[PDB]
Amino acid sequence: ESLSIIDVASDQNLFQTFIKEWRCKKRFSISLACEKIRGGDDTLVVGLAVCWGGRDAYYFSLLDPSLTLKDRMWYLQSCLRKESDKECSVVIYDFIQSYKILLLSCGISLEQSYEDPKVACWLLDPDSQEPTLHSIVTSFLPHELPLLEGMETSQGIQSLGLSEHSGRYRASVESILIFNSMNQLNSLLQKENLQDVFRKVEMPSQYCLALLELNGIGFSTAECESQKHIMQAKLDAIETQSFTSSDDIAEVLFLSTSKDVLNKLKALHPLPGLILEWRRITNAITKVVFPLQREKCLNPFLGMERIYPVSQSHTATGRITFTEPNIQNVPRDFEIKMGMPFSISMRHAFVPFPGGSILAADYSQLELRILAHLSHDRRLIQVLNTGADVFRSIAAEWKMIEPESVGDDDRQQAKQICYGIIYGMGAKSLGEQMGIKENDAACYIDSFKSRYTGINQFMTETVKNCKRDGFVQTILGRRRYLPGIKDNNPYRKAHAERQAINTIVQGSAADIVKIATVNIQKQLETFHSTFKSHGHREGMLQSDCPIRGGFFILQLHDELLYEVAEEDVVQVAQIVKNEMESAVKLSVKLKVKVKIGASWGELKD
Amino acid sequence: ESLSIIDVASDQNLFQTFIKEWRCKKRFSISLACEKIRGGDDTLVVGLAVCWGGRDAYYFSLLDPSLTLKDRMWYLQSCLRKESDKECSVVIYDFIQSYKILLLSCGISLEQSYEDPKVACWLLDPDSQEPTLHSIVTSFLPHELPLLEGMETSQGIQSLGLSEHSGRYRASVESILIFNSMNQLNSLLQKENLQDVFRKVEMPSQYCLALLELNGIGFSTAECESQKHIMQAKLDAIETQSFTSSDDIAEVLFLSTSKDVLNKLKALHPLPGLILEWRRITNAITKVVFPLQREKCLNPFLGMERIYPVSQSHTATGRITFTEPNIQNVPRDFEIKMGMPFSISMRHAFVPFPGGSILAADYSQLELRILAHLSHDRRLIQVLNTGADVFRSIAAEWKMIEPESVGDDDRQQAKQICYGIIYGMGAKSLGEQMGIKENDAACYIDSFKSRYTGINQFMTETVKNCKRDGFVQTILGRRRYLPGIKDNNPYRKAHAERQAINTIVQGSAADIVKIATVNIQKQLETFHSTFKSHGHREGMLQSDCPIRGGFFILQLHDELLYEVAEEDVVQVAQIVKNEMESAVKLSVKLKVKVKIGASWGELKD
DNA sequence: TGTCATTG
RNA sequence: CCAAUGA
DNA sequence: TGTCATTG
RNA sequence: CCAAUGA
Numbered sequence A, B: 001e002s003l004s005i006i007d008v009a010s011d012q013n014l015f016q017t018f019i020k021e022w023r024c025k026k027r028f029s030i031s032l033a034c035e036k037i038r039g040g041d042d043t044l045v046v047g048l049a050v051c052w053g054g055r056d057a058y059y060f061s062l063l064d065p066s067l068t069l070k071d072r073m074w075y076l077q078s079c080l081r082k083e084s085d086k087e088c089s090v091v092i093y094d095f096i097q098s099y100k101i102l103l104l105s106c107g108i109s110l111e112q113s114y115e116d117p118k119v120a121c122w123l124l125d126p127d128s129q130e131p132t133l134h135s136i137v138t139s140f141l142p143h144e145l146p147l148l149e150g151m152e153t154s155q156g157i158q159s160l161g162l163s164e165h166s167g168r169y170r171a172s173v174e175s176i177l178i179f180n181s182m183n184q185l186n187s188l189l190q191k192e193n194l195q196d197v198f199r200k201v202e203m204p205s206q207y208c209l210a211l212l213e214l215n216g217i218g219f220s221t222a223e224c225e226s227q228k229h230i231m232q233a234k235l236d237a238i239e240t241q242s243f244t245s246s247d248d249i250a251e252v253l254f255l256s257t258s259k260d261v262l263n264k265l266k267a268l269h270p271l272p273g274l275i276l277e278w279r280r281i282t283n284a285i286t287k288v289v290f291p292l293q294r295e296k297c298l299n300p301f302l303g304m305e306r307i308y309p310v311s312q313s314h315t316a317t318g319r320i321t322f323t324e325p326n327i328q329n330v331p332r333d334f335e336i337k338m339g340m341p342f343s344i345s346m347r348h349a350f351v352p353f354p355g356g357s358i359l360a361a362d363y364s365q366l367e368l369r370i371l372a373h374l375s376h377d378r379r380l381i382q383v384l385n386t387g388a389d390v391f392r393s394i395a396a397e398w399k400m401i402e403p404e405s406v407g408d409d410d411r412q413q414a415k416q417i418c419y420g421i422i423y424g425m426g427a428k429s430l431g432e433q434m435g436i437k438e439n440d441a442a443c444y445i446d447s448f449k450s451r452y453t454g455i456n457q458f459m460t461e462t463v464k465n466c467k468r469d470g471f472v473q474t475i476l477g478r479r480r481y482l483p484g485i486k487d488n489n490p491y492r493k494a495h496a497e498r499q500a501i502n503t504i505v506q507g508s509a510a511d512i513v514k515i516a517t518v519n520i521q522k523q524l525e526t527f528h529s530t531f532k533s534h535g536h537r538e539g540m541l542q543s544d545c546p547i548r549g550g551f552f553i554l555q556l557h558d559e560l561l562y563e564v565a566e567e568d569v570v571q572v573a574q575i576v577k578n579e580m581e582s583a584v585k586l587s588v589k590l591k592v593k594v595k596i597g598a599s600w601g602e603l604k605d
Numbered sequence C, E: 001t002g003t004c005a006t007t008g
Numbered sequence D, F: 001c002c003a004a005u006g007a
């Protein structure tokens, strides 16, 4: 007596008593049944698979040439919708993707609270391997594993592994396991406080990424085929007297006298040596355009081309990524040659929708301010709260004891020391990086961390905490476990120490930018009566008018990219600033710098 | 090099150049691809199959988890839509059904001109066998028969015979044959004038029946379970001194002295004999409720039960029918017993939607008026144009030479003679029917048809026309072929003669009621801003508010049933009268009598 | 591949 | 009588 | 299952 | 230096 399915749409008494039962349920699972048409090699959504306890699934379908139950999309769209008083926690496996396909097939704008188990078991152990439905079942909810023998999926929902088994069967089996497993995950997240952040940061952020993935990013093939010639034409320049792999550039041709070639870090007096410029430009027309101008998609509804990124997460730090052609990795603008300069990059081939401007918002010295908070460094806090240049002023402040109004441009080497200490690199490599001596660098380190005595007493505190705990937790309490902090090998433990400091600092940075993106979105879908993403317009208005409002476009770790209409681009920037500057209330003022333009090779206001 | 399919949605250049090509096409075929989900034993629409020449099909699909082409329903709904200047002739095989399923799955309210080949080849030869896609191919367009070998469907569209073959393949094969065949059918309909009536009566009427089939008819199980007891309780009454098949009622029990029993047509002085009342009531609780209360369907969107009839057509006369429980065949109201009377029928268990009233419109002596037109019977025409009682006045007029103001109730036997002559039954059976003598009946016939000399000279004219032609054509020119009018056997030829008169008279009746229903609908969907059938509300508003307007509910040969809202039930009745009374301009005034009530056991205004 | 009912 | 069902 | 580039 | 890709 194992696993029962209830074909809900198979009657009328059964269906109307079903949604009655359903419309007073707070928690319940959901799983799309997606089957392939005979090939016509296209997939299609053919049924929900709602469950809310035990081994009992309620399979909705989308019903053979009938005249009753033709309001089937209405019933789902009406149940998958917050309606004040109580909103529902809807556990969905590949939630990010599910949300998309649930819209780009049948115009259902899922508007509830969500609880993905795939990200719940990540949050438990961020150094875990990418969790499958199988893996989740194998660990949590050990029994009901026999329901997977023959299913054979190690990636996404039962939809994503469509194999012989009917859409309804697996969709039902998903909902059962997904529901009952998430209940055990919720129990563990509760045990270590992570349920609060999972529900009010990590899942809300997942929903934010879903919106971003639907929107995508504008891409001008025109202004990309511009750089395709600007770079290639100014590639083979003044080259008097065949570039290949490694063994090619002989130093026995001219005149330190080793091999490698990568470290051509002189080129000052000895010859022109314009090799690094060629090496960059060539490697910046191949990891940017030629893999990307193949994923470009003409979207005639918008009347432009766009690319559709796939957010990653499941990152040990907490920073969000993208698969394939990752738009985070396109190189920023830089000069060339012709005496006369020009500025190039593929960041000029990323465009707003016609009549709009792209909006960037960087946090500017966020990881610094996090350490300033955690490390109760008296003057380090007070230097940041003044709103003065946080490197001009930090140079004086106490490092060089006095200057304040005239303190040169040793700020450029004042930050180099600052970041060099928090990055946790040895005096040797820092000294080689600044262009000074290993000794005099070690002197500058000690003469900085003494003048800001908080930094070093913080690191020694958090490393000893990590040694006794076996893990370190960020400012939102998300733990990362490190077994290397016990290791006998000095290098391995030393590596574990600078792993611990990184995750508690630039993980807490990932935490604030999450809280920032969700608090923005909540505040963003209010004043603007014209509703949400490009998906909820090409898809939801397609089954439920100018382009007012702004949409989430790109996540750059500590920087956010939005795409706003020029009409109301000023009313949004206030929403972005005020929300990011108040995301978390710290002992240090969170400042942000916003830039507005026709790409993201643009100036500021 | 045979049969090419173009997966149109497989690109973007291909798709956008496709609908560009399409949006300037006047004629083109269409065929729904309908595949079954694994069982979840429900069918689903998965693609159009547009074609417009040769062996080249353009297969639309409804596309795998993508972000471009998610406006797919819009593109069809926008192409399947008249847009002024030019409207498109859309050839669809099982058009009546196709239209329904094209709406009760994906909210596409097909709004073009239509050309069904299944009804085009009926119109050619109404005594033909029910035409299949195979049969249409076998006769017209003899080649491309090999495209059917393995398909094996002998009923409906390639959808309706879903078997192993992919929805796209057969849907494409349909569109090719359907298009190219209909072109040959259009050529034959042109050759004999029938293309004009096919396009402006027969197909428009088919569309009218589609609307009716979507609407259905209200059915109160409450007021049906009323008669279920009223009839059954007043069934076994005063029965002093075991009813079975035939051999049971012996006349050797009491006291003309044969068998049969069916002809208990005395029961006057000899005993009560209340056997015909029991025989009727029992056979009127079994061919009306017990086969029908099983096809009743709760439709919660309307908040009532309804039944969904399936119109027939392909009738030698031209009158439209319904399959299964045919609502045309429910017996009208009649009295019973308790001294004290009550009136019963199942026509009291057919109801309007809450807040509405049912509207009936009978043509009253239509077949008479058709004969009055065709047979140029001078006074017969003039008797009908006065608007006086057309049987009180017809009794005098000339039959009894004079009376006019006092002419008794021999009108009841004046019409009996009238209908008896046009029905074409012998003096024998008419005489037995009126309760007079075969001789004195034959006298009354000759003394009527002499006083109205048109009737007999018309019949002798049209029978000699039919003898030389091999067929007779109605007032709209729809031919019916009769090989029996040559037959040596006197009975067979005599039968063929009264077949000829019937079809030219009560076929021309089917023609006017068609023209009536289409001219009503055209005038009906105008003033009423709130749009069309119950299908275009539970289905089209479901993918494109009170219940103002009126909808086509039942076709009773010469009578139409509508279902109108009480708010504006007076504004519609004017539309129905004026349209039916002007359907065709004859030499005789077409009068109509309308009845309004809470069922169709109701009174008039 | 008969005969009787119901509706028009 | 004719046309649709129906025993 | 190495080393060099890009982004933060 | 750490984390994501990438030769």
Ligand SMILES: Nc1nc2c(ncn2[C@H]2CC[C@@H](COP(=O)(O)OP(=O)(O)OP(=O)(O)O)O2)c(=O)[nH]1
Pocket: B362, B365, B366, B367, B368, B419, B423, B506, B558, B559, C008, D002
């Ligand atoms: N051949 C034939 N035609 C009929 C018969 N009954 C009606 N019709 C045709 C010709 C006139 C027209 C009237 O249809 P209705 O049944 O609405 O009218 P009725 O008042 O019941 O019939 P009638 O006019 O014979 O008195 O339909 C019938 O029994 N046989």
Ligand SMILES: Nc1nc2c(ncn2[C@H]2CC[C@@H](COP(=O)(O)OP(=O)(O)OP(=O)(O)O)O2)c(=O)[nH]1
Pocket: A362, A365, A366, A367, A368, A419, A423, A506, A558, A559, E008, F002
């Ligand atoms: N470990 C590490 N963290 C970095 C690195 N670059 C940036 N971060 C983190 C810490 C500060 C923050 C700044 O990100 P951005 O790249 O936007 O800032 P930047 O001005 O380019 O860098 P920086 O502050 O080091 O001068 O992100 C890096 O190379 N290593």
